[PDB]
């Protein structure tokens, strides 16, 4: 069975944990319980192939930034999440991408840019600006909501497809 090592990264509060829990458990977490580091393993069928997804749900709190080196070395693909109502979280994407590129010594690391909380009316990052950033990196971009499940399966499955091409 093919195993995919996915790592979910992004600023504190963007919805990394809510996206992961929505994907796996099909329910939305309203509370804000900051993460240190959680991991999940789930079997799913993607494009007719039974896949084992290893999902690492990382800390957005900068206090845990020293843990990034290990997960960036081990991870095969990265879900780079910002929230569409948090401009700082969008600005922080570039830092996560440079860090990943440095650790893996490559400009071709599987990544997907995710603009989460698309159910909210309080947008501060236009879809076009995020699509332009993703085009500059050569990676896919999808908007998601951990509350409604919009784009959630597509975001994770797209990241798996980005890893799979290299095999
Ligand atoms: N409306 C809405 N709220 C969301 C969405 N995703 C997460 N939230 C809310 O945002 C808050 C933070 O979500 P959480 O999943 O804990 O974020 P995180 O990025 O894991 C936080 P940390 O980096 O500290 O672990 C919570 O109140 C959660 O309900 C979403 O798509 N829509
Ligand atoms: Mg979390």
From Swiss-Prot:
PROSITE patterns to which the protein is assigned, alphabetical: RAS (PS51421)
Description of how activity is regulated: Alternates between an inactive form bound to GDP and an active form bound to GTP. Activated by a guanine nucleotide-exchange factor (GEF) and inactivated by a GTPase-activating protein (GAP). Interaction with SOS1 promotes exchange of bound GDP to GTP.
Record: glycosylation sites: 35
Entry keywords, A to Z: Acetylation, Cardiomyopathy, Cell membrane, Cytoplasm, Deafness, Disease variant, Ectodermal dysplasia, Glycoprotein, GTP-binding, Hydrolase, Intellectual disability, Isopeptide bond, Lipoprotein, Membrane, Methylation, Nucleotide-binding, Palmitate, Prenylation, Proto-oncogene, Ubl conjugation
Reaction equations catalysed: GTP + H2O = GDP + phosphate + H(+)
Phenotype for residue 34 to L: In NS3; characterized by a defective GTPase-activating protein sensitivity and a strongly reduced interaction with effectors
Membrane topology: Lipid-anchor
Xref: InterPro entries: P-loop_NTPase (IPR027417), Small_GTP-bd (IPR005225), Small_GTPase (IPR001806), Small_GTPase_Ras-type (IPR020849)
Segments carrying motif Effector region: 32-40
Residues noted as binding GTP in the record, renumbered to the chain: 10-18, 29-35, 59-60, 116-119
Compartments where found: Cell membrane; Endomembrane system; Cytoplasm, Cytosol
GO annotations of cellular component type: cytoplasm; cytoplasmic side of plasma membrane; cytosol; endoplasmic reticulum membrane; focal adhesion; Golgi membrane; membrane; mitochondrial outer membrane
GO molecular function, one term: GTPase activity
GO biological process: one example: response to mineralocorticoid
Pfam families: Ras
The record's account of how the chain is modified after translation: Acetylation at Lys-104 prevents interaction with guanine nucleotide exchange factors (GEFs). Lysine-depalmitoylation by SIRT2 promotes its localization to endomembranes in endocytic pathways.
Result for mutant: residue 38 to A: Decreased interaction with MAPKAP1/SIN1
Subunit composition and interactions: Interacts with PHLPP. Interacts (active GTP-bound form preferentially) with RGS14. Interacts (when farnesylated) with PDE6D; this promotes dissociation from the cell membrane. Interacts with SOS1. Interacts (when farnesylated) with GPR31. Interacts with RAP1GDS1. Interacts (active GTP-bound form) with both SHOC2 and PP1c (all isoforms) to form a tertiary complex; SHOC2 and PP1c preferably bind M-Ras/MRAS, but they also bind K-Ras/KRAS, N-Ras/NRAS and H-Ras/HRAS. Interacts (GTP-bound form) with MAPKAP1/SIN1; inhibiting K-Ras/KRAS activity.
Function according to Swiss-Prot or TrEMBL: Ras proteins bind GDP/GTP and possess intrinsic GTPase activity. Plays an important role in the regulation of cell proliferation. Plays a role in promoting oncogenic events by inducing transcriptional silencing of tumor suppressor genes (TSGs) in colorectal cancer (CRC) cells in a ZNF304-dependent manner.
Disease with which this protein is associated in UniProt: Leukemia, acute myelogenous: A subtype of acute leukemia, a cancer of the white blood cells. AML is a malignant disease of bone marrow characterized by maturational arrest of hematopoietic precursors at an early stage of development. Clonal expansion of myeloid blasts occurs in bone marrow, blood, and other tissue. Myelogenous leukemias develop from changes in cells that normally produce neutrophils, basophils, eosinophils and monocytes. Leukemia, juvenile myelomonocytic: An aggressive pediatric myelodysplastic syndrome/myeloproliferative disorder characterized by malignant transformation in the hematopoietic stem cell compartment with proliferation of differentiated progeny. Patients have splenomegaly, enlarged lymph nodes, rashes, and hemorrhages.
Family of the protein in this entry: Belongs to the small GTPase superfamily. Ras family.
Protein name, per record: GTPase KRas
Record gene name: KRAS
């Amino acid at each position: 069975m093919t195993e995919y090592k996915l790592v979910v990264v992004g600023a504190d509060g963007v919805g990394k944990s809510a996206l992961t829990i929505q994907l796996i458990q099909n329910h939305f977490v309203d509370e804000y319980d900051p993460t240190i580091e959680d991991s999940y393993r789930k079997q799913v069928v993607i494009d007719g192939e039974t896949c084992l997804l290893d999902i690492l749900d990382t800390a957005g709190q900068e206090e845990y930034s020293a843990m990034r080196d290990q997960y960036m070395r081990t991870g095969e693909g990265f879900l780079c999440v910002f929230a569409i109502n948090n401009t700082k979280s969008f600005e922080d994407i570039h830092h996560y991408r440079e860090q990943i590129k440095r650790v893996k010594d490559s400009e071709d690391v599987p990544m997907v840019l995710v603009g989460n909380k698309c159910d909210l009316p309080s947008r501060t990052v236009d879809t076009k600006q995020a699509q332009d950033l993703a085009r500059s990196y050569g990676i896919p971009f999808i908007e998601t909501s951990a509350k409604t499940r919009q784009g959630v399966d597509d975001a994770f499955y797209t990241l798996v497809r980005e890893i799979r091409k290299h095999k």
